[PDB]
């Protein structure tokens, strides 16, 4: 699976999303949506801004 670091600090504003850290190394799940991409931060799963993380 694809890690991905985080740019910038997010906090989940949704029951799908999830909270990630800037420099947190997240391993991505699915990017099929431009926007929104499923990654697993520690030990939860759900998606952050496509935007605020970088393919590694």
């Given at each position: 699976k694809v890690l991905v670091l985080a740019l910038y600090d997010y906090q989940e504003k949704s029951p799908r999303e999830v909270t990630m850290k800037k420099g947190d190394i997240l391993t991505l799940?699915?990017?099929?949506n431009k926007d929104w991409w499923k990654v697993e931060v520690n030990g939860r799963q759900g998606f952050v801004p496509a935007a605020y993380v970088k393919v590694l």
């Open positions: 799940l699915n990017s099929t």
